[PDB]
A paper describes a structure:
Plectasin consists of 40 amino acids and shows well-defined secondary structural elements in form of an α-helix (M13-S21) and an antiparallel β-sheet (G28-A31; V36-C39). The structure of plectasin is stabilized by three disulfide bridges (C4-C30; C15-C37; C19-C39), which is typical for this type of defensins and leads to high conformational stability. Plectasin contains a cysteine-stabilised α-helix-β-sheet structure, which remains intact upon fibril formation. We have determined the structure, kinetics, and functionality associated with the pH-responsive self-assembly of the enhanced plectasin variant PPI42 into helical protein fibrils.
In our negative stain EM measurement, we observed a small portion of fibrils existing as single protofilaments. In order to investigate whether there are structural rearrangements upon formation of the mature fibril, we analyzed the 3.4 Å resolution structure of PPI42 forming the single protofilament obtained by cryo-EM. The structure of the protofilament was determined using the structure of the mature fibril. PPI42 monomers show a very similar arrangement in the protofilament compared to the mature fibril (all-atom RMSD: 0.727 Å). The PPI42 protofilament forms a straight right-handed helical structure having an axial rise of 3.76 Å and a helical twist of 156.5° between two monomers. These helical parameters are very close to the seven monomers of the asymmetric unit in the mature fibril (average axial rise of 3.75 ± 0.15 Å and an average twist of 156.48 ± 2.25° between two consecutive monomers, see above). Small variations in axial rise and twist between the monomers in the mature fibril result from the curvature of the protofilament, which is then stabilized by the interaction with a second protofilament. A comparison between the cryo-EM structure of the mature fibril and of the isolated protofilament showed high similarity, indicating that protofilaments form prior to the supramolecular assembly into a curved mature fibril without additional structural rearrangement. We observed frayed fibril termini and a small number of single protofilaments (black arrows), suggesting that the protofilaments formed first and then assembled into the mature fibrils.
Residue numbers in the entry:
A (entry chain H), B (entry chain L), C (entry chain P), D (entry chain T), E (entry chain X), F (entry chain R), ...: 1 to 40
The structure:
Amino acid sequence: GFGCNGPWSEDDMKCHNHCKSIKGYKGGYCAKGGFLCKCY
Amino acid sequence: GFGCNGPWSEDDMKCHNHCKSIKGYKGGYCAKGGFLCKCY
Amino acid sequence: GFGCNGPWSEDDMKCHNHCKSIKGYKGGYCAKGGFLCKCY
Amino acid sequence: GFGCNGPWSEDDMKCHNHCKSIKGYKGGYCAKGGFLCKCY
Amino acid sequence: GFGCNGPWSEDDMKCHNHCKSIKGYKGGYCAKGGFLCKCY
Amino acid sequence: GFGCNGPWSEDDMKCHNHCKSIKGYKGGYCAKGGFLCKCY
Amino acid sequence: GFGCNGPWSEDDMKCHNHCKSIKGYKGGYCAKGGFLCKCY
Amino acid sequence: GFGCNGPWSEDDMKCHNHCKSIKGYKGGYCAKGGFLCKCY
Amino acid sequence: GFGCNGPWSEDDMKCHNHCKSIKGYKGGYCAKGGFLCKCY
Amino acid sequence: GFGCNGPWSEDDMKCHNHCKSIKGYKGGYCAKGGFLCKCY
Amino acid sequence: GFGCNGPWSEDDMKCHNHCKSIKGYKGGYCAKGGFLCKCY
Amino acid sequence: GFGCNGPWSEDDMKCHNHCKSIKGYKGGYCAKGGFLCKCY
Amino acid sequence: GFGCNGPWSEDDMKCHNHCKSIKGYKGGYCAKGGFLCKCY
Amino acid sequence: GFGCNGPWSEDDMKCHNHCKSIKGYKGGYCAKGGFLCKCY
Amino acid sequence: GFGCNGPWSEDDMKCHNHCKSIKGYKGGYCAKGGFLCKCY
Amino acid sequence: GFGCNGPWSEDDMKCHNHCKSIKGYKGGYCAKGGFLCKCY
Amino acid sequence: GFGCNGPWSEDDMKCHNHCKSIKGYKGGYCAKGGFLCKCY
Amino acid sequence: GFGCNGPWSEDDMKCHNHCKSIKGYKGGYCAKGGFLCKCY
Amino acid sequence: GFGCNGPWSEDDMKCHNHCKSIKGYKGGYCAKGGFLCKCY
Amino acid sequence: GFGCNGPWSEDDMKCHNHCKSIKGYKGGYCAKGGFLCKCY
Amino acid sequence: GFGCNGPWSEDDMKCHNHCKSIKGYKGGYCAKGGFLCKCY
Amino acid sequence: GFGCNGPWSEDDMKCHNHCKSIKGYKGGYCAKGGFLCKCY
Amino acid sequence: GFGCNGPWSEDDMKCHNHCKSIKGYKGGYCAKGGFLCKCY
Amino acid sequence: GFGCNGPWSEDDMKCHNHCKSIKGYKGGYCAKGGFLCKCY
Amino acid sequence: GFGCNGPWSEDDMKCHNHCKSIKGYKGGYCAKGGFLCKCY
């Protein structure tokens, strides 16, 4: 979810913004080859 | 199922929430290129 | 069949349940881009 | 034909059964986005 | 024409048979979402 | 809208032209698997 | 409803406008393969 | 547009031919997971 | 084109065979993540 | 081809089995990042 | 985001240009194996 | 095969378990940069 | 496995923690150039 | 960019040619493990 | 882990900083040829 | 280029053969840790 | 760190320049066989 | 080539066996720090 | 070979054990600066 | 072995401790220019 | 730096030429066991 | 050990300091041609 | 340079041959403990 | 230490200068056959 | 050359045998402190 949907993803930052909603995380990215919102 | 339906999927967390319904799993994602609810 | 009908599919588990009807298979999913009930 | 008629298709296996009528094919599915009986 | 008439189509192969009437084509299907006899 | 209507869409550029009607956008396309006019 | 009626839909924005009638939503589209007014 | 319509696309080269209509481009392809005519 | 259509591609060798139609090329494959017939 | 189709590939050994069909090759794999049947 | 989308990325410099938008950074690249816009 | 599918691989031990099925081998790993089940 | 997946690995300690599950081993690392969980 | 895209890179010399476009540089290569066009 | 990931490592000091988290250690480095966070 | 692409390189001699195309050079190799065709 | 990364290091002086940032040190080098920024 | 590929090399003796294919040479090894098949 | 692979070697005794497989030799070591299994 | 690995050796006493495991030997050192565990 | 990079160094004279850039020095060499450009 | 590592040794006094840790010894040095910490 | 590279040197006579290129010198050798081409 | 490192020593006077740092000593030299800084 | 390579030399008689290849010489040895094949 959060937009991590492979080639059909769109740069909506939903993964990034959602990850930003958690303390200790300054961003997120589509891991698992573009299919998981992984927060860091 | 559980919303893992490729480009026609919608961020309903149905995969994630369904995976959450099992002990030992803190989330889920659309593996198999967005076509399988894989729990982790 | 078994519900693997692209965007018009509904999460009826018919693919999954049908795949469950075979020994050695613990689930199924809509492969071929959501148009084939592939059992695993 | 053979039931591959998009959202108006019904799970009659007509595509699958028809494909089964040919040697070397163990099934069929509605390719072309649910509008062609493709045998495999 | 040739039977490609959406949900009111009937599996008369008229699209398929008509497409078969042309060299280089081994079949046909109701493209444009079930409303055009497309030959292949 | 704007023609993004899945397989029944027609190449009327209505999505593209409509997107062109907004500053900063040089085109548009049928995202959400062909069912949303997404402007870019 | 709201115009999400598959190939017989017309670009009346009824889905879009209806979705606009709810706070937090900047548009809507015909999900479920053109048969549900999904608001976003 | 230009035929980039996901699984319902047909190999009409409309994307490719349209891209060919621009200097500096020797072809085109359906990017965005088969839903955008991207010229190169 | 030539069958390079992501998950909805089918192993028709159309990319490969089409690439074979050019001197100096012994095959082809679906580059750009399965969305371009790249000849080699 | 031969199943080398990125994340949408399935472990059908089609690449491997196809490579096995050539003398001097004891297997094959999806090179080019999972998008080419490379025989060895 | 910013185009870092694995094999489906396109050389749009969106990662690079976006990274350029920050002082002290003269470029960017798709780290995490092509799935994160890392600025440098 | 056997799960050696680059970033889209999942830790199913299919490579490892498959390699275990051969005498003289105590494990396996995804060589060729994560795209070949190499047994050892 | 155990997370040793080259550039797509994530610092989940799965290799390390898994290695810790064996007596005589105080850690593990991704040998074979980041593609094997080697325990020490 | 410039083709430095890991395993999905193609030998288009785009990195090399782009680097050649700068005085004092006689070539370029995909540093950062194949993910950065580094000029030399 | 801790960033010791061969050529795909980035100078995040994660190895160094992590090693700093232990008494008696004034730094760390990527031993085992860049694939192990060794503390000193 | 010329096949010097780290772990995803294949023994195509493209580096070697390309280097052979220059007088005074009897071979080539993937320097820079497998990421540059260096001629000698 | 600081560029001391074995064969994948690049002559960026990051080790040297970083070492220069400390009083009493007129340079630095990649000790530990090219894997530690040692200041002198 | 011949397997001399740094940490991603595998003990396939391809360097050694290839060197054995030349008179006056009783073996070979991966010189240039594991990146050249040097025959002796 | 036989594990003599520079810094990426692991103490598998493969060089030593392999050397032990020859009469007159009571051990082996990684000569040529850790890149040749030399038997003694 | 036993840590005698040239410049990439680390002062783990593995050579020394291993040599200590034999009667008549009070230590060991990396002979052959740092590439052999010689016991004394 | 300046090419003094152990076994991965290449005879680019970068150490030598760089040392030549200073008055009183007629050459340079890779001291510290091939890991420091020492000028003389 | 203790830093007695031939040309790759660094003047860390580890040999000397370690030797100092024993009564009756006022220093140490790298005997065996720079490859053994000999205490005196 | 000229092959004087410690244990990783190879008997290429590059030091010797290079020294031969100067009048008054009948050979050369790797002085400075195998790390300088000294001509005589 | 202090530069007394056999053939790999360099005339840095580190032995001499270090010896000069002690009253009653007007110099130092590399005793023990070039492997000990002996002060006099 | 000819094996006169300091502590990393091996008793290959290459110096001796090479010296034997000249009339008036009954042997050779590694002069210059083990770094020159001197014939006598």
